[PDB]
Amino acid sequence: RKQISVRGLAGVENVTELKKNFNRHLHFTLVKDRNVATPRDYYFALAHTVRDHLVGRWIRTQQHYYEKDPKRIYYLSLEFYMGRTLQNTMVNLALENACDEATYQLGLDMEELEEIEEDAGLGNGGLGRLAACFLDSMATLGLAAYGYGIRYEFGIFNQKICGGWQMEEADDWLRYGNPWEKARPEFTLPVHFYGRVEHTSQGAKWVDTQVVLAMPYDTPVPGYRNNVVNTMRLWSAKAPNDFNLKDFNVGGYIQAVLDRNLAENISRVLYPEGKELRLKQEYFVVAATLQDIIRRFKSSKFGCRDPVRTNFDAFPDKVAIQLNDTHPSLAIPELMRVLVDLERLDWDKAWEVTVKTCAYTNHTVIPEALERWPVHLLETLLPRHLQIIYEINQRFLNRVAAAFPGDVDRLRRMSLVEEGAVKRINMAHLCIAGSHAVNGVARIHSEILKKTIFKDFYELEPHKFQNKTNGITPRRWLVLCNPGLAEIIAERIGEEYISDLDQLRKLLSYVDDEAFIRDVAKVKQENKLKFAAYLEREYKVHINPNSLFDVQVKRIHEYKRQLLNCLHVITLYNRIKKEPNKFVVPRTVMIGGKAAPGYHMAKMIIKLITAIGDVVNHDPVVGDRLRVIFLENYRVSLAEKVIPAADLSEQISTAGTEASGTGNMKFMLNGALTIGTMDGANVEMAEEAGEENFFIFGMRVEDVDRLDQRGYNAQEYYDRIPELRQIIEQLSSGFFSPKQPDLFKDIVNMLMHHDRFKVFADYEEYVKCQERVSALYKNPREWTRMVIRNIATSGKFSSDRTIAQYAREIWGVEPSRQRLPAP
Amino acid sequence: RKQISVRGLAGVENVTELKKNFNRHLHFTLVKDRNVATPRDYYFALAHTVRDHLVGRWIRTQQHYYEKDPKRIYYLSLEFYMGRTLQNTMVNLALENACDEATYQLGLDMEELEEIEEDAGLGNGGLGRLAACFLDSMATLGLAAYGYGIRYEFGIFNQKICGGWQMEEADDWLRYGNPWEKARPEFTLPVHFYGRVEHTSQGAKWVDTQVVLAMPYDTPVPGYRNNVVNTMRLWSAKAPNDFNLKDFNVGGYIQAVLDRNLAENISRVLYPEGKELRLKQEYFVVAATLQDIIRRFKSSKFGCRDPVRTNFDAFPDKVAIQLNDTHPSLAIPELMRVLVDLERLDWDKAWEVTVKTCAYTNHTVIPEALERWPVHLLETLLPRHLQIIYEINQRFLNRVAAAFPGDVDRLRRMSLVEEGAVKRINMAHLCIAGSHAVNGVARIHSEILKKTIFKDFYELEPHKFQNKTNGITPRRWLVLCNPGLAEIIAERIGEEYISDLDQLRKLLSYVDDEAFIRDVAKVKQENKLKFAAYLEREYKVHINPNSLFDVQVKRIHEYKRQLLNCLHVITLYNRIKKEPNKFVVPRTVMIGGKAAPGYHMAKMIIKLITAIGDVVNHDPVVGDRLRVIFLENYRVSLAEKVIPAADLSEQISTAGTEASGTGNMKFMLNGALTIGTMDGANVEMAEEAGEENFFIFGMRVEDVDRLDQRGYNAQEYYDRIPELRQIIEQLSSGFFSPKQPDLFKDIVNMLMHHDRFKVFADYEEYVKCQERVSALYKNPREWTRMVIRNIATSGKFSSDRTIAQYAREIWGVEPSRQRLPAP
Numbered sequence A, B: 001r002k003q004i005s006v007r008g009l010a011g012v013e014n015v016t017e018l019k020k021n022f023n024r025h026l027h028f029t030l031v032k033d034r035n036v037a038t039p040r041d042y043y044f045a046l047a048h049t050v051r052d053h054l055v056g057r058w059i060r061t062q063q064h065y066y067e068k069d070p071k072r073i074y075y076l077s078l079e080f081y082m083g084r085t086l087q088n089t090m091v092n093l094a095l096e097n098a099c100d101e102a103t104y105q106l107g108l109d110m111e112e113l114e115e116i117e118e119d120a121g122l123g124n125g126g127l128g129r130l131a132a133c134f135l136d137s138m139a140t141l142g143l144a145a146y147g148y149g150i151r152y153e154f155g156i157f158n159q160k161i162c163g164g165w166q167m168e169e170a171d172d173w174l175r176y177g178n179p180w181e182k183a184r185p186e187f188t189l190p191v192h193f194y195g196r197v198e199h200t201s202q203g204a205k206w207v208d209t210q211v212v213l214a215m216p217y218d219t220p221v222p223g224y225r226n227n228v229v230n231t232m233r234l235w236s237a238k239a240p241n242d243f244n245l246k247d248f249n250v251g252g253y254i255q256a257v258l259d260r261n262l263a264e265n266i267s268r269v270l271y272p273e274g275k276e277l278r279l280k281q282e283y284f285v286v287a288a289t290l291q292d293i294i295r296r297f298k299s300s301k302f303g304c305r306d307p308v309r310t311n312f313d314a315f316p317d318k319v320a321i322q323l324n325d326t327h328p329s330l331a332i333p334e335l336m337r338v339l340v341d342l343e344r345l346d347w348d349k350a351w352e353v354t355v356k357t358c359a360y361t362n363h364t365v366i367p368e369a370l371e372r373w374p375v376h377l378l379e380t381l382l383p384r385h386l387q388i389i390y391e392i393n394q395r396f397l398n399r400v401a402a403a404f405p406g407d408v409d410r411l412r413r414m415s416l417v418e419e420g421a422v423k424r425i426n427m428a429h430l431c432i433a434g435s436h437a438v439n440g441v442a443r444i445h446s447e448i449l450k451k452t453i454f455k456d457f458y459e460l461e462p463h464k465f466q467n468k469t470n471g472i473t474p475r476r477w478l479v480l481c482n483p484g485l486a487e488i489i490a491e492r493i494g495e496e497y498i499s500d501l502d503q504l505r506k507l508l509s510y511v512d513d514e515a516f517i518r519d520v521a522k523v524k525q526e527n528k529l530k531f532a533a534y535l536e537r538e539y540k541v542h543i544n545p546n547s548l549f550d551v552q553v554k555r556i557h558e559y560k561r562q563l564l565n566c567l568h569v570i571t572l573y574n575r576i577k578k579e580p581n582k583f584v585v586p587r588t589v590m591i592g593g594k595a596a597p598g599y600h601m602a603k604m605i606i607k608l609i610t611a612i613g614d615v616v617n618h619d620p621v622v623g624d625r626l627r628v629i630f631l632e633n634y635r636v637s638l639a640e641k642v643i644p645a646a647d648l649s650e651q652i653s654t655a656g657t658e659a660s661g662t663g664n665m666k667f668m669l670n671g672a673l674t675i676g677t678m679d680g681a682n683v684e685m686a687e688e689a690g691e692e693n694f695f696i697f698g699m700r701v702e703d704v705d706r707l708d709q710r711g712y713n714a715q716e717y718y719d720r721i722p723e724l725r726q727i728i729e730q731l732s733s734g735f736f737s738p739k740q741p742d743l744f745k746d747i748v749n750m751l752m753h754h755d756r757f758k759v760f761a762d763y764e765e766y767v768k769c770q771e772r773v774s775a776l777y778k779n780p781r782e783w784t785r786m787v788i789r790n791i792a793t794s795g796k797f798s799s800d801r802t803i804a805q806y807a808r809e810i811w812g813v814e815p816s817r818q819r820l821p822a823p
């Protein structure tokens, strides 16, 4: 027993012990051989050789949190955009240099193998990239945290462009195993759907439920060389498999083969309206988590630390639960029904707990997008939770009456129950009311929350509405994807920046140092060459390495604006062709992101960007002076290839729309210049960088508002501006689509007659700020120094900071970049 | 590359290294530590610590067959009855000693661990056990042998006895997985169902087919200390999972939810009439299997060795296919289809290869069991193979026209299509016609296939009909279950016997030596003591470890006549009550079997068998002289426990009914004397041991036919025998059944009016035999020496001989007990 220990099983940075484990895993773990193995096979030998090291420190970290029993923090997200784990674990564990030497002497190439990894198909965008950033900060800052989500077998679609139209293939990333996860069938747990609630004697009982099972999966998150490793625990839904003879529902009719497949596809796909499945997913991820939580509260030495009920008095002391946007809101009534009904605390002792345990991050501005289930839907698959949301609600509206007596119309606005045709439950209001700290994700967002969206909630409980500005981690997003820029930053000011990003302001001392200024420049010339190379070798084009890499990687939605960028492209194209011998600084325009199935505007925008691409790229006058590439299937591992490469980062949303913008910061720390309207995270970036270092343009929010107030009439702009006029008529006569003239019709009329987002208004000014971009790029010394200024200022944006601001003002816990001993 | 090698990966029988790998797997493979490891957890780390030694010589064995390129033979069977692998892998790998000592030091008990393992639910009976002894023998005699077949998730049922009535529970043995298998998602193959045959130009083209993917798992089977390890490849079904939006079958309707579950439970359930799922399961295994076979033929250094087509000319020199029973039969129409439609050989060359490739083992005697499929089922799901099977039939019936011209009635008796109401295709005739060796399984059984059942085929091709008498393997069924007998046989004659069993004849020189006699009776006393203990500790009873241990462990069918034996037990009962003080040899009668859900006699029988025992084992005058126990959920782990203990082997099937009987042979080998009719396997074991040393009795097969001839009129017996007349009236009045008198009413009538197997005929003489039995028992020295003659004559029944004969006589390859160098 004490002889069965984690202890003599490594020597780490040792090429000869990593070579001997690489050989044990190909053979014994994979049961393959060198006569029969593939690159996929050699990646799982190595994936497994790095994994041994990662779980050793996983074991010791978790033992060390049971024995020190700290406050535990549960990040609850319905999306975890991890993406690729091999190089990151080697960079956070110190093994990259020894893995590379050992594989190299085993006659293979790590860069090959690295590129066989499938991106962890668990996210689709922002909301999820961010949780995965915060897990890296959370593990580095010694915190005792947990990521909890649904594990999606089919990710969210793969993008393929066929005839310049987006096709959605499916992502089965799980296709040859995922070497980084450990399936725990032994901790499967019931999740209860439907039923009826029987009020028996001392409580209600939620009886006659269908059950789905929630099976957990453990993937370990390491911290930047601080020897802790925390946990990502994702839940697969699985059918009871009795459906055969056992139950005597069956035998006679197996049409309960439908429970089975409608059980199993809670875990099967990301999304992608008021659908029974979405709410089955939110309940499911929330329910199986809350048990696993309450379990460690009772179990984690606190069984013996009962002093009263294993008291839920010290439950908020040792637990926090973050509900990242309204997607886990039912963890508030689900916690209340476990406490009230299963344990037995009275309603107010349990409420005390709930509101001192839950905190909620908000990431939406337009009210048209806050969460909202119909009540009949809630009646039908969660009876007792619609009961609880009604009691939470009656109390809350009386609290409001203890505060603004006489105001009726406030009661009929701060209710969790919305009236119309179809009464709903407003999950936003739940979340505010059931928690102790609400925080938006940019200062202008948190403040417009307080000021407009959650105002009445601000007046009754002003103390709650915090803010925590969004952040990126310096590891994946500067050490790991841009090792070259990191190298020279360490040459001047050392490592500490990796684990402490405001230290990068020291770089302003070098602003005029010619060595630094040739070195930052060189590293980008490296990074562009390499991406220009991939732009032939996986997908195809003839990129010029010397052009201005202009990139817009943003979700393809109408407000997000690539239609602005297209008209500026067809303005350049048109210019180059009207005077084929003027010097125009050459540009590589690259746009990427995924439409969203069935949003057809979004789909005509992917078809425009490609047809433009087929004309400008193939016309001979334009030479190599302009090219328009659609980067296909944009995703986290493409993002770390292209962001190192870009020199201009098109941030151009109509102002007032964006909330924040985590990839904005990915371009700034990675030596690009942002052109952008003033909104979301452009503001605290411009503010850190000093506005003159930034290409801010366009209407500001107030100007949007005035235009609305007198009403935007898109024909006036169409009638002033002679270029705009022309490009519109080119779309329309099918200059860009000869076979189908009429093909962009709907994009003409969108523009011409119902632009909710004022493309034509920010036109004139947009191109003039581009002229200011072209014009500076044609003087390499000063452009490279504006870049030094954006980079030495990054600091305000590391997720190690945004997290500390969670730790201290919200979870109430202290971060610590202390090495834990280990291995 | 060349430095990626198996070489430095194991310092085997070394306790200090096995402790090391233990701790690697508990932690790194299971991602568990001693603070949270269960006995399952420690069971799995040990599984894996032993597995590393396995896969290492899997390795070496399989590299060696590729370099050497031997005839490698594919053993196809739809049920592989494996049961627990650990001790069997250690003993075979010689690791048992160092692992026990190792776990002893780690302070774990290996025996507590070895009982966690679930009994590999791939099998059901004889057909399946036979496949597992044959795979052991094929390793030991280093053949390039593959076992192929489906992976059943749900085994078959795990029985429970609730109130003396049988309950089938399900075997979800794969619940916490299986440490001995490697998933190969890499080699997932399509298998097509339904479709339509487009006769296009140079052939036929099977189009519009539904697909079911076969994904394979690999399991290693080790030899007896020879370092060859062979493969067991079991197939699992996986529906294609585009079923969401991709295909445009769906979106609109996902009612092809059904496709994906009707696909999935191909692999789910063992069976357990003309049900499309059996036919889809059988074709499932054939198709996947043969694509692996031809994949390995063209790959296995023969892609280099083409000379013509990568010709199938030499296919029978490198492949042997064994059709174990009629479940694999579409192997003959599927190998033609591939050869003829997919490659392009013509029908007479392709047929040449099939017949020289295919060989067929029959295990049935009664024509009523042979398998037969409606042509309307085969047209619907395999419409192409119905074609091939008719052309196979036509051309075979012209061969028969060659040979017996003028004959009309043989054409129609011999034909593959069968007429009546429901036109059938006779699968046994397919096999004979496209196989080059048809064989039975005991001498008599192969002769009555030659003489009655297949005789018109025996005339056209008398060369075809072989016999290869079954076998039991000495590793698992003597060494493993019985160490104590293993050991004392080894002092006297050495270890070669375990891999050479006929030399157990050497023992016959020690017949009168009292040291052997004594030792030989000591080990049984050991074995009985321990089995007596297991009958209290796991299940409960107060066995008298000195009693004559009478066990019948056979399939609860009428023809298996446990009822016979019950008439005899009730007889013993009645005597001990009539004559309280006469000296009677104390016995403990133990019966065991799984009913067969749906067969109502068998369910009524286990009921008898429990309540006889409720009566007698509680009744005060019988004391401890008689007890009757039912051995619940008989499976392989129970066989290796009760077959070591047994003194009397109850082998009583009506004669003419058995084809063979492998528990028969197991019992002989462990010094248990046989009471038994002159049937099945009993015949050649009587012939080995000498009839003086066998308790033969009851109506020989001749006498059966005579009794049928004139008519078995059971009442005559009732009316001669006063014990028989009495025990019938005891069953009937309710003596055994006082709360429902009338319960055994349908057993009493059966016996009395329509016993298809004549229990009453052999009653008188059966119990006369039984009296001989108890007499000899009451005479140790002469009891214990009959045993010695029996054990010493066991040689003909080691499966090593059955395979050696298959090897030389049907497959065309040489045996060799040579130790591959390795590890």
Ligand SMILES: O=c1[nH]cnc2c1ncn2[C@@H]1O[C@H](COP(=O)(O)O)[C@@H](O)[C@H]1O
Binding pocket: A059, A062, A063, A066, A067, A296, A300, A301, B031, B032, B033, B035, B036
């Ligand atoms: O009370 C304990 N003492 C020591 N180690 C523990 C204890 N509880 C859990 N562990 C470790 O904690 C890990 C994570 O467990 P979880 O937090 O319960 O999911 C396990 O793999 C063990 O390594």
Ligand SMILES: O=c1[nH]cnc2c1ncn2[C@@H]1O[C@H](COP(=O)(O)O)[C@@H](O)[C@H]1O
Binding pocket: A031, A032, A033, A035, A036, B058, B059, B062, B063, B066, B067, B296, B299, B301
């Ligand atoms: O061409 C080969 N040379 C040497 N060993 C081979 C070759 N092909 C396969 N093997 C071995 O054969 C094993 C089984 O491959 P399979 O029989 O093709 O399924 C591999 O694990 C290797 O050990």
Ligand SMILES: *Cc1c(COP(=O)(O)OP(=O)(O)O)cnc(C)c1O
Binding pocket: A124, A125, A126, A129, A553, A554, A555, A560, A634, A635, A636, A637, A639, A660, A661, A662, A663, A664, A666
């Ligand atoms: C960081 C990141 C993101 C986050 O993207 P954005 O906030 O810039 O814009 P929206 O998509 O409009 O929210 C998205 N995708 C990837 C790959 C990534 O690394």
Ligand SMILES: *Cc1c(COP(=O)(O)OP(=O)(O)O)cnc(C)c1O
Binding pocket: B124, B125, B126, B129, B553, B554, B555, B560, B634, B635, B636, B637, B639, B640, B660, B661, B662, B663, B664, B666
């Ligand atoms: C050897 C064996 C068998 C085989 O049983 P038999 O061949 O003796 O006769 P039937 O019972 O009629 O098939 C079945 N099950 C186990 C566990 C076993 O070891």
